[model samples]
Target: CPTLDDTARGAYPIDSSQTYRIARLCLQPTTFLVKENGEFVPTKLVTRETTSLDQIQGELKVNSDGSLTFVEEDGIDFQPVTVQMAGGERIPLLFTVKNLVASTQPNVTSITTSTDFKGEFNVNGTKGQISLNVAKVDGRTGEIAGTFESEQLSNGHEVKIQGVFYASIEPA
Candidate 1:
């Protein structure tokens, strides 16, 4: 299947220094909520493979306030999945996290963003609830890992997701 990320290349100038990995999620695994007969239904992001829907390409960053944050971006090279839209480039999900101070365990902060949901509907981050754990932090380098259970609300729609990620912070 043709990929959207391929379209992203050359068009979207990515930082070549960073490595992006697709996120591994558990939903009701990365589901987009839709209205059905006056009820909100859980429609999971169908994937042909495990990492297809889970792979969220992004890196962690050390903020000026000495806090660590993670933001999802494009330009990731993921596993190959055939026959399914998993890696078929039909849909893409991006996310973020903000927590971690210096070298603290369970460095806590809520996800804060109005991340634009790219799809037929218009939805943004109105509610974010996730915890961040600092695995390692030294100098300009850091590693963050955590499990996610989150929801996004906008105009009667919701973007619900839960998963785990261990991403190394991009060097500044």
Candidate 2:
């Protein structure tokens, strides 16, 4: 993992005539909202199936055509699963990502963006494989931007699970 520190030296030219690599990569973990009754209720049912940012490994490519592409070096998929509570009750939960963000440092040729997230999360305490779709890619530097979302049921417990993450890529 490369820190988004003095990598680019100066602000990128923002020229859409050439492709570039992202300067930073980040992974953000979040919790979802679950409803215990007919209304949206909050509970301790927040589970982060994917916490380590290292789970996703890949390089982002930005084209002069303003199109973004992500080359996944590794990937995986996890389905929704059920979890048993302390009260002898089981609950279902899912994990996902949404509205990712990527930014570069000041005064550097750093280009940063987020990869549009896509995929599904099934089960609890399990791994969910995901394929990323890009929403926006920087031409000066390869950066991706987008969102990811997931849903699950806690065995009639009515739980909501969602997440959003971001990653910036730079020279190794």
TM-scores for the candidates: 0.33, 0.40
Clashes in model 1: which pairs?
A: 22-55, 22-56, 23-54, 23-55, 23-56, 26-29
Instruction: Give one digit per residue, the lDDT tens place, for model 1 in 42-96.
Output: 5445555564233334444434443334455543322321121323333344333
For residues 76-150, could you state the per-residue lDDT of candidate 2 as single tens digits? 322344444545454565332222222222323333343233434444433343444334444444444444444
Prediction RMSDs, each to the true structure: 13.2, 8.4
- The per-model lDDT (C-alpha) reads 0.33, 0.41
Model 2 deviation from the true structure expressed as Cα RMSD, one decimal place: 8.4
Q: Give me the runs in candidate 1 sitting further than 4 Å from their true place.
A: 1-46, 51-64, 69-73, 76-143, 153-156
Winner by lDDT:
2
